[PDB]
Design a protein around this ligand. Structure first.
Ligand SMILES: N[C@@H](Cc1c[nH]c2ccc(Br)cc12)C(=O)O
Ligand SMILES: N[C@@H](Cc1c[nH]c2ccc(Br)cc12)C(=O)O
Ligand SMILES: [Fe+2]
Ligand SMILES: [Fe+2]
Ligand code: NI
Ligand code: NI
Ligand code: NI
Ligand code: NI
Ligand code: NI
Lengths: 239, 236
């Protein structure tokens, strides 16, 4: 209907703003070494395993007979595996450093990674009382923001993968391609053939605005971390 | 009122049941070295900094002008400091080990610490749409569970503190005494609950103790799976 078309169009408008943030202009800048552009990588530690748990324990409901919830369950099974790819590339990039346990805790719970650390928390709280069709809007918005980030990160990641002859799995075109999905339908196909009540329309606008605001807060922390480390880089080793 | 009095009574009944859990009988058992009884200490890594955040970001509302919310805000300023004491005692016990960054992440996000890691998350979801007096019930319940655990942990804690002449701050009587030190139960004792608030307050107390019980189950399972990894304190 006209409601759902406004919702999907809001997601495109937010994606077009999000794509233009300075972080992504930096990450895409082929005049800076890919090792310097990926100095933000360790910041994702505060997010990636929280995102696995969001999929496993918040999005998923294994007991639902609901049409929409079953499609969510299939998609979130796959999306909850990507944290291992994060750990794989953490090691390849030279960021899996020996440190005290307390240094790792103080890093993850840094005040400079608050928005990074709480993006999944915020989504879980938003998602607590949503019917399955409305959870599909959360997931579609969140996945749209993720695909912008990983399409950008895969640029320096693929440069290092080629130069070192190593297979990257997280900052990699393979992650973007598996995430987009191409069996079971994509959520965007389901949403395109669903009509929203006026109440669902106003809730879906709140959802899209929040997911993009929280994602922009995360990207702002990445930008400030990069600025505090431009004198630092990833330390990949050539195979 | 009969309502509030029923809620303060249910907190004492849940406290009495919680105190009996097998983990606490183990931690109190002075025939076991206190280094073995604190094998569970690193598990608290998946909780203590989440609890700091619960107090800073979820319980606290610096935009609020309400009377009860202002009392909560003040309470949260104290409780948001105890994570540093956790990190102090981690180092003293020999648990602040050098490891790969990925080994620290895999520890905190272990499936065997799921309930530990999600306790504050669960409290934040429970609390996010509560009026302030109902947030006070969550805080009083959660503090009641915490007082049971730190009363028990302070036994092996203060044994090691005296034996090594070091100042322990988290598994210590100073922590137990500051928890106790207007206080919230005073306000609750003088506050009248609608039937709706009484039904919700029952749910809040049941959930706080069920989630705390889940956490304590994981601590007990951890000790049984890591029976060699005793604390390694050093004499001063
Ligand atoms: N594809 C991501 C998940 C993701 C989905 N949306 C995101 C937004 C921001 C950040 Br950082 C990450 C994401 C993953 O596998 O961790
Ligand atoms: N006094 C504790 C807080 C606390 C309050 N309730 C608790 C329940 C379980 C565990 Br483990 C800890 C708590 C602290 O300062 O971290
Ligand atoms: Fe992913
Ligand atoms: Fe405390
Ligand atoms: Ni998918
Ligand atoms: Ni630095
Ligand atoms: Ni809500
Ligand atoms: Ni307190
Ligand atoms: Ni282990």
């Amino acid at each position: 209907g006209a409601g759902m078309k406004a919702i999907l169009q809001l997601i495109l408008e937010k994606r077009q703003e999000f794509e233009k943030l300075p972080c992504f202009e930096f990450v895409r800048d082929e005049t800076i070494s890919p090792e310097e552009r990926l100095i933000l990588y360790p910041c994702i530690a505060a997010f990636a395993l929280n995102f696995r748990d969001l999929n496993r324990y918040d999005y998923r409901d294994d007991n639902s007979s609901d049409y929409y919830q079953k499609i969510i369950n299939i998609h979130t099974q796959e999306d909850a595996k990507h944290w291992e790819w994060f750990l794989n590339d953490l090691e390849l990039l030279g960021f899996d450093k020996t440190m005290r346990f307390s240094e790792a805790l103080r890093f993850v719970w840094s005040d400079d990674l608050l928005h990074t650390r709480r993006l999944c928390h915020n989504i879980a709280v938003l998602s607590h009382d949503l019917e399955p069709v409305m959870k599909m809007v959360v997931i579609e918005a969140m996945e749209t923001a993720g695909l912008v980030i990983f399409h950008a990160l895969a640029k320096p990641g693929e440069s290092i993968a080629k130069a070192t002859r190593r297979k990257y799995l997280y900052v990699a075109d393979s992650h973007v391609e598996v995430e987009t999905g191409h069996g079971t339908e994509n959520i965007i196909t389901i949403l395109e053939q669903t009509q929203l009540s006026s109440e669902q329309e106003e809730k879906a606008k709140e959802i899209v605005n929040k997911v993009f605001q929280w994602s922009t807060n995360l990207i702002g922390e990445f930008e400030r971390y990069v600025k505090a480390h431009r004198s630092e880089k990833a330390q990949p080793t050539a195979a």
